[PDB]
């Protein structure tokens, strides 16, 4: 025990007096620093490099001074450590925090956030639960450890299992928060989620009464959202070393939890004050459906804004947080309620893919090829559930059952999809296809079936054909007629909305236009027609007019049509795989969006519609079209970079009954206008569609009928051969 | 430019005090942590340099004979914390706190700066800027 204060003059030794208070230390030692004993020494050196002497000081102190001291909430608690010493010391010693930058706002008075309205209150200790109420466990039932389906009926009904996995199998883990800004946190981990891309990374660690979501952008500042039990206090690391307890920025603690926001943007850098907005997320509800509903909502919203910026900074953070806290909710809900449901465990699998995609691609701007994600949850064993379902498929259906069989099939896949799942997905598409040619709309059940059928077939020279043929089918299904309805759907759904009491889900508003390749829907001709179809939905009409300005209604209709162009077609990775032929040469037009429409043909080939002068491919220029808005149908080849012009020969249609053999099928009936507007892409799928093609207006299918249309309407038939033909009649 | 692996060795403690300032000598440096679990069973001392343009703190080891550079503000904060607990009692301990009090009062201020953009990894690879 030695306290010794020295004064240095020139460098030989120093002039000092050493004062030991209560204990014996080697006194002659001071000629050499007190390394010998297990005790640590401290040396403060003040030297002005003018060669000026300054002064120094020393205290040798003992070793022990560095050593520290219904749902059960008292079993696995959240305990903050005092310092790095008994904890993970690596990131704290090695951080550039406080040296290069600071994770916290420089102004301490901006640290304390206000509590949001939607945040939990004494009367609502947890949050707001969504209306399709979580089914109560039947009184008699006993719950198995894990979740399993041994039968087909299991998916339709509710399947229950115990949340005990949370309390029994768990791991105590130390957590270093962002940039070592706060001392570590011991917690019992119920799960983790990782989402990565080119332009973004988000790490989500979740445990009993605990969540950490680390959110980072290549183009933006990182933030961490930490959730602790309200009774818990976190300690911020700061420059001034003598202040022992300071609270990292955040709002006041609530009934259930306390939330902390680490990272800058609180005082200034945020576009608005969303600080209190994002912090409120974990305290807004325990219903995972609630957060995901809000996620799907901002998803659609930002895809309309896709034009100006590849990256939406705010929306990225938001949808990230939402995704994260939903897993926090779900885990914490099960713990609190002692049980779980099968739908819940399956749903988060699909939600973790579909939302991450939109998060990284559209939100972060990253290349879709590099979008990946991983989840590890103790109450979830997806790979076991996969094998269970794999053996289920391996041993007539209504759209409802199909929607459920496909959803769970998409939710659990490692990339291995059961053959009969695909077979079901195909049949769903085609059945919707034959439906949509006679009728211009789809009910919410139909859309959900289409959605999952698509995601299954585009999931992964066999599977390649599925990608091409579905993109073909999606494109055909999307007509001028349907697009106006489909956009009205998205608009109506967003118009009448209840974040508080109801779920919003994208598959409920879906349509083939979201899965097609068409960039022409934002063209004035269509957007204008959309506006004129608004009063046909009087409720939606009144909502729009009583808030949005007449000018803004156009923007609205433009912005919703945008979704159909940007959802699939704008993704290059989807194109590059299923239509490499478009990209084969020095071709710019693909990425310059000069290709308005893309029509996959026999392998190695696809048609194209371009407004400009085509620099490649076999070119059919329709000459009846207005010159200022030209339509050039172009047949592209993978191995052929040559540029030529074809002749459109004309043929006539036989009598519908005349041939039981089908020489027509596989072609595409394209209906356009002399104004340069592309309307209907309809494929001839079956011998019956062919019969309806030969019809004069005795055809059920309207684009095949030159009556409901008008003089401007013209039509052309595209063979997969590359042969383009005019029909007589 | 010139980087720093975070540590040179030293066989004495008189070397560290007379050692130059990484702040002045180099441009960009990297703080480092010793390849040992428990610092206490190893670390023989802590040296603090106040008047450097970017004040620094050195963790010196006897047996290892290595001297590591660590975050000046974070380390001393974690120091004054662990020795400042309610249950801790000593007159020696008070001398530590007496010395640890006005450490950064003379030297240059801490950063008000915003960090740089880009992804962040977790604790495993300590706050690394990479996405995947």
């Amino acid at each position: 025990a030695l306290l010794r204060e020295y004064s240095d003059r020139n460098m030989s030794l120093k002039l000092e007096a050493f004062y030991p208070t209560g204990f014996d230390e080697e006194l002659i030692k001071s000629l050499h620093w007190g390394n010998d004993r297990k005790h640590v020494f401290l040396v403060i050196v003040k030297v002005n490099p003018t060669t000026h002497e300054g002064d120094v000081g020393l205290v040798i102190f003992p070793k022990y001074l560095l050593s520290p001291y219904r749902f059960g909430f008292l079993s696995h608690p959240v305990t903050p450590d005092v310092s790095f010493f008994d904890s993970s010391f690596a990131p704290y010693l090695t951080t550039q925090h406080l040296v290069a930058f600071t994770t916290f706002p420089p102004n301490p008075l901006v640290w304390h956030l206000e509590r949001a309205e939607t945040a939990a209150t004494a009367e609502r200790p947890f949050g707001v639960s969504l209306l399709p109420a979580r089914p109560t466990v039947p009184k008699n039932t006993i719950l198995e450890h894990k979740a399993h389906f041994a039968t087909w009926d299991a998916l339709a009904r509710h399947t229950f299992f115990s949340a005990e996995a949370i309390i029994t199998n768990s791991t105590l883990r130390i957590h270093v928060p962002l940039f070592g800004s706060v001392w570590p946190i011991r917690y019992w981990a119920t799960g983790s989620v990782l989402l990565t891309s080119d332009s973004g990374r988000v790490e989500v660690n979740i445990g009993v009464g605990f969540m950490s979501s680390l959110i980072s952008l290549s183009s933006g500042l990182p933030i961490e959202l930490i959730v602790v039990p309200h009774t818990v206090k976190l300690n911020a690391v700061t420059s001034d070393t003598t202040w022992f307890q300071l609270n990292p920025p955040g709002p006041d603690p609530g009934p259930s939890y306390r939330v902390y926001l680490l990272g800058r943007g609180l005082d200034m850098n945020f576009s608005k004050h969303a600080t209190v907005d994002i912090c409120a997320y974990p305290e807004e509800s325990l219903d995972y459906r609630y957060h995901l509903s809000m996620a799907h909502t901002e998803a659609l919203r930002m895809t309309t804004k896709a034009d100006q910026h590849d990256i939406n900074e705010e929306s990225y953070y938001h949808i990230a947080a939402r995704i994260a806290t939903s897993i926090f909710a779900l885990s914490e809900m099960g713990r609190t309620t002692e049980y779980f449901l099968l739908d819940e465990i399956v749903d988060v699998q699909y939600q973790l893919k579909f939302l991450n995609y939109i998060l990284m691609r559209i939100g972060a701007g990253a290349h879709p090829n590099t979008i990946s994600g991983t989840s590890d949850l103790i109450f979830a064993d997806p790979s076991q559930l996969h094998d269970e379902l794999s053996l289920l498929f391996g041993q007539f259906i209504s759209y409802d059952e199909a929607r459920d069989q496909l959803k769970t099939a998409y939710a659990l896949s490692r990339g291995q999809d059961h053959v009969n799942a695909l077979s079901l997905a195909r049949r769903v598409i085609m059945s919707i296809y034959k439906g949509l040619l006679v009728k211009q709309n789809l009910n919410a059940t139909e859309r959900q079936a289409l959605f999952f059928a698509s995601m299954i077939l585009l999931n992964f020279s066999s599977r390649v054909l599925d990608g091409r043929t579905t993109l073909l089918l999606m494109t055909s299904m999307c007509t001028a007629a349907h697009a106006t309805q489909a956009a009205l759907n998205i608009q109506e759904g967003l118009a009448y909305l209840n974040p508080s009491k109801h779920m919003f889900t994208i598959p409920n508003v879906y349509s083939p236009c979201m899965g097609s390749l068409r960039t022409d829907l934002t063209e004035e001709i269509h957007v204008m027609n959309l506006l004129s179809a608004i009063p046909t939905r009087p409720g939606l009409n009144e909502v729009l007019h009583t808030q949005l300005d007449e000018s803004e209604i156009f923007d609205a209709a433009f912005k919703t049509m945008m979704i159909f162009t940007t959802w699939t077609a704008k993704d290059l990775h989807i194109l590059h795989t299923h239509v490499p032929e478009v990209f084969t040469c020095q071709d710019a037009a693909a990425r310059n969006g000069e290709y308005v429409l893309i029509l996959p043909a026999v392998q190695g080939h696809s048609y194209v519609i371009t407004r400009n002068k085509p620099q490649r491919g076999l070119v059919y220029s329709l000459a009846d079209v207005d010159v200022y808005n030209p339509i050039s149908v172009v047949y592209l080849s993978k191995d052929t970079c040559v540029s030529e012009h074809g002749v459109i020969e004309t043929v006539a249609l036989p009598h519908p009954d005349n041939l039981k053999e089908c020489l027509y099928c596989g072609s595409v009936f394209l209906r356009y206008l002399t104004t340069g507007a592309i309307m209907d892409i309809i494929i001839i799928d079956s011998k019956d569609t062919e019969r309806q093609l030969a019809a004069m207006g005795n055809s059920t299918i309207p684009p095949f009928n030159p009556d409901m249309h008008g003089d401007d309407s013209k039509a052309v038939l595209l063979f997969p051969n590359g042969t383009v033909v005019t029909l007589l009649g | 430019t010139p980087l720093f692996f975070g540590a040179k060795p030293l066989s004495d403690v008189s070397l560290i005090i007379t050692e130059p300032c990484v702040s002045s000598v180099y441009e960009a440096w990297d703080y480092a942590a010793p390849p040992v679990s428990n610092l206490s069973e190893a670390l023989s001392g802590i040296v603090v340099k106040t008047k450097c343009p970017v004040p620094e703190v050195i963790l010196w080891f006897k047996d290892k004979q290595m001297a590591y550079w660590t975050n000046p503000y974070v380390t001393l904060k974690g120091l004054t914390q662990s020795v400042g607990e309610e249950h801790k009692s000593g007159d020696i301990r008070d001398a530590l706190l007496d010395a640890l009090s006005g450490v950064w009062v003379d030297s240059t201020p801490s950063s008000t700066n915003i960090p740089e953009n880009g992804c962040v990894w977790g604790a495993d690879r300590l706050f690394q800027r990479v996405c995947q």
Partner: antibody
Amino acid sequence: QVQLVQSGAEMKKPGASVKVSCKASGYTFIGYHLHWVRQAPGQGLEWMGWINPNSGETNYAQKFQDWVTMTRDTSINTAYMELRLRSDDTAVYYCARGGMTMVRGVMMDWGQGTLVTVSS
Amino acid sequence: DIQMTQSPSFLSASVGDRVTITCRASQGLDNFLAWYQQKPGKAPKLLIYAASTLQRGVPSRFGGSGSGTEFTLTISSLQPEDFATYYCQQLNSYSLTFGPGTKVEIKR
């Protein structure tokens, strides 16, 4: 040794304008805020406001808001306080260093004070 | 603007006693409060910077405790040198308010 020397002492008639100076030492001037607190005879303490010696920015109390101005000089490490005397302003004026960068309001070190008398 | 209350306003005690001064805030100050010692004719001196923490160099006889709206300063063993008036101060706000102070004399 951190020290602050104020200067020196003076008397000014009502309606005038007075300047008090604080001479820094022992610490980094740019790195810690400067606070002003005045004390009437036989009365308690009243916080007038603070100034960031680096930023130059000032924070004032409502009572002194239109009646006071605070300024510094980064070179000689001095801070200045200029007040318009309403004749109720007779007091001793102190300047003090904020000792905590992340917590506002902690006066770690004080000056020796300057008595200002207001009379005709 | 938070108003601060101190009780007692005045007290006198004897050497060796334990003096307890109290501080009251209009609303929750959480961790942030200070305690100052002003001798007659001299400048204020900081005692307790956080609610509970003793400034290095200040005698161990001085201590503090509190949270929220209520804080208490305690002199463990009173000495003749302790004659002063003691103030409490709000910390970490745009407006920093002082307690009215507590006069402490010494009985012989």
